[PDB]
Amino acid sequence: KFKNSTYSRSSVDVLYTFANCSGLDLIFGLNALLRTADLQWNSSNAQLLLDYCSSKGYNISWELGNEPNSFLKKADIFINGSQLGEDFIQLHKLLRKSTFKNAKLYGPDVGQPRRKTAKMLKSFLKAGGEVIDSVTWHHYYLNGRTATREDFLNPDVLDIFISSVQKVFQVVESTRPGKKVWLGETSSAYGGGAPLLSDTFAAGFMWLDKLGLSARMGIEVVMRQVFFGAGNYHLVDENFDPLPDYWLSLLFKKLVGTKVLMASVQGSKRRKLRVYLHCTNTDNPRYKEGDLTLYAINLHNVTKYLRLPYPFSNKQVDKYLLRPLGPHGLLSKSVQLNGLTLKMVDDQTLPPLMEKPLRPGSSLGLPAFSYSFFVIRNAKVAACI
Amino acid sequence: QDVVDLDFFTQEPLHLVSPSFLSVTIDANLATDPRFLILLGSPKLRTLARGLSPAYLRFGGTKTDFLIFDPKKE
Numbered sequence: 001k002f003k004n005s006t007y008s009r010s011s012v013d014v015l016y017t018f019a020n021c022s023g024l025d026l027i028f029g030l031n032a033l034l035r036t037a038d039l040q041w042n043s044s045n046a047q048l049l050l051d052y053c054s055s056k057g058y059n060i061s062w063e064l065g066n067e068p069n070s071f072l073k074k075a076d077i078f079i080n081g082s083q084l085g086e087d088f089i090q091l092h093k094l095l096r097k098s099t100f101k102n103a104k105l106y107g108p109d110v111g112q113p114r115r116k117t118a119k120m121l122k123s124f125l126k127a128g129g130e131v132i133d134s135v136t137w138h139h140y141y142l143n144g145r146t147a148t149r150e151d152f153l154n155p156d157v158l159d160i161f162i163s164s165v166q167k168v169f170q171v172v173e174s175t176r177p178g179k180k181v182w183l184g185e186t187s188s189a190y191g192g193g194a195p196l197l198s199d200t201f202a203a204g205f206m207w208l209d210k211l212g213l214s215a216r217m218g219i220e221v222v223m224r225q226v227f228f229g230a231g232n233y234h235l236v237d238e239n240f241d242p243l244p245d246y247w248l249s250l251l252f253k254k255l256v257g258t259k260v261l262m263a264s265v266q267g268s269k270r271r272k273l274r275v276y277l278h279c280t281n282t283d284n285p286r287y288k289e290g291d292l293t294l295y296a297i298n299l300h301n302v303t304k305y306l307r308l309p310y311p312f313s314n315k316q317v318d319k320y321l322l323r324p325l326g327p328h329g330l331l332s333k334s335v336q337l338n339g340l341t342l343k344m345v346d347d348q349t350l351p352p353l354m355e356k357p358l359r360p361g362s363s364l365g366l367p368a369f370s371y372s373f374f375v376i377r378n379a380k381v382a383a384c385i
Numbered sequence: 386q387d388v389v390d391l392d393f394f395t396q397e398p399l400h401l402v403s404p405s406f407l408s409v410t411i412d413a414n415l416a417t418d419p420r421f422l423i424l425l426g427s428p429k430l431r432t433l434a435r436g437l438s439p440a441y442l443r444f445g446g447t448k449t450d451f452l453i454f455d456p457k458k459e
């Protein structure tokens with residue numbers, strides 16, 4: 001099912017300039033299935049690419065291989081983790097000899113940690129862990145071909161992510177304690193996404209929950225499959241129009257800061273009402289050092305009302321509640337923020353993201369099957385300064 | 386009854402995520418599309434991408450391991 005193909009200097013340039021003009025940092029995956037008769041990685045093609053990139057002055061980070069746990073299925077070649085580790089050592093020597101001697105290297109981009117993948121990750125980290133800057137792995141909740149609407153709204157499905165994360169950290173802490181762990185590719189459903197689900201408002205429960213859990217559990221970076229592309233799980237569709245998960249992502253970016261805190265529900269029901277807490281993003285011009293950003297998911301079929309604890313009970317709160325634009329409800333590809341449809345102003349201009357100030361002391365309203373951010377103003381939290 | 390009390394831990398940060406915590410991918414498969422240059426040249430797509438800055442853009446996917454750089458091709 002997978003044929004070799006080639007790409008050109010032109011393609012490399014298209015990719016880099018897209019990242020550069022967008023303010024994004026490019027990580028480029030190298031081909032790990034180029035093998036010598038000894039079954040060592042043949043670095044010759046990567047050398048060509050590195051020299052080319054060096055000659056254009058491109059600041060680029062590197063990966064090598066994608067889902068090496070699946071190579072036997074994809075290519076009928078088995079590469080064990082030890083060997084892969086040695087291949088990373090060889091790539092690292094090439095980088096150290098290049099014009100960008102401090103370029104970063106990430107890997108091994110394994111799938112989620114089933115017994116055999118866990119063993120490959122372990123032997124990889126034993127062999128090659130010293131030269132990677134972060135450990136990368138991938139996660140999808142469901143097969144896109146069989147995923148249902150009910151699965152997208154099911155906390156028992158959302159909860160399976162917790163156990164994968166715990167297994168990855170168990171492997172890393174047994175081999176390279178303290179090494180950063182990244183989700184290097186993740187989404188709702190594999191096989192390109194679930195038709196009519198992965199590109200809708202309903203996709204956001206999984207996306208926001210994954211963000212919340214990832215931050216809470218110590219994952220440092222989460223990479224969303226895909227910004228743009230043929231799969232249903234795209235943030236931006238083939239007409240270059242943003243889907244609900246784009247607008248959710250933009251809000252998260254504007255509001256949620258780097259310092260992770262914790263929230264929980266006193267009741268302890270704890271599955272369909274899901275709550276996360278960070279310091280507010282300090283780059284947001286509206287807010288000040290010490291403010292908190294709460295985000296919440298309500299998977300109940302009724303409105304829930306949240307009460308803030310002392311000393312935050314009477315603070316001014318800004319609400320950012322996302323709801324689908326009808327008639328397709330959770331299956332909608334359009335979203336409203338506090339009752340206003342999110343839409344580009346023109347091709348060069350994102351809309352403003354307008355808050356709804358709540359009455360101080362009011363409880364935080366969260367409708368059925370919705371998600372919201374709440375910024376607690378003048379929270380004066382010392383940990384967030 | 387539908388009113389729920391929250392408890393907050395706020396004494397210290399439990400973790401620190403990257404400023405690029407929410408990052409994105411472009412699948413390797415997209416570089417086999419005849420219109421790759423048109424797609425990633427789109428000024429509209431660049432505007433959308435800028436909105437998620439700072440972030441990593443990861444170029445990879447299954448096709449990572451079936452792509453070869455050819456410096457002569459146009």
Ligand SMILES: O=C(O)C1=C[C@H](O)[C@@H](OS(=O)(=O)O)[C@H](O[C@H]2[C@H](O)[C@@H](NS(=O)(=O)O)[C@@H](O[C@H]3[C@H](O)[C@@H](O)[C@H](O[C@H]4[C@H](O)[C@@H](NS(=O)(=O)O)[C@H](O)O[C@@H]4COS(=O)(=O)O)O[C@H]3C(=O)O)O[C@@H]2COS(=O)(=O)O)O1
Nearest residue numbers: 111112138139140190191192226229230231412414446447
């Ligand atoms: O959406 C399409 O355009 C499309 C429709 C086809 O029906 C679909 O083929 S399929 O239904 O037989 O799968 C095919 O899907 C593409 C997808 O479009 C493309 N992404 S893109 O941005 O739109 O270009 C890409 O995504 C894959 C990633 O490249 C890959 O890293 C990761 O690995 C999966 C693995 O593929 C999956 N097997 S499966 O896809 O055949 O079902 C396996 O079970 O899980 C891996 C993740 O591991 S983990 O959960 O343990 O962490 O995701 C891929 C993905 O499936 O989305 O390629 C796919 C698949 O193309 S194909 O040629 O292999 O069929 O195109």
Ligand SMILES: *[C@@H]1O[C@H](CO)[C@@H](O)[C@H](O)[C@H]1NC(C)=O
Nearest residue numbers: 034035036037042043044045
């Ligand atoms: C690596 O690949 C190149 C080009 O395909 C080949 O000519 C070269 O001899 C290979 N190197 C080794 C060490 O096998």
Ligand SMILES: *[C@@H]1O[C@H](CO)[C@@H](O)[C@H](O)[C@H]1NC(C)=O
Nearest residue numbers: 038039040079080081082083
């Ligand atoms: C891993 O693969 C290499 C290269 O094929 C082989 O020589 C080595 O014995 C293998 N390691 C283990 C633990 O099986």
Ligand SMILES: *[C@@H]1O[C@H](CO)[C@@H](O)[C@H](O)[C@H]1NC(C)=O
Nearest residue numbers: 272299300301302303368369
């Ligand atoms: C909520 O869920 C239950 C399912 O047991 C259902 O019986 C109930 O009537 C639903 N409520 C609403 C408001 O739809």
Ligand SMILES: [Cl-]
Nearest residue numbers: 269270271272
């Ligand atoms: Cl429940």
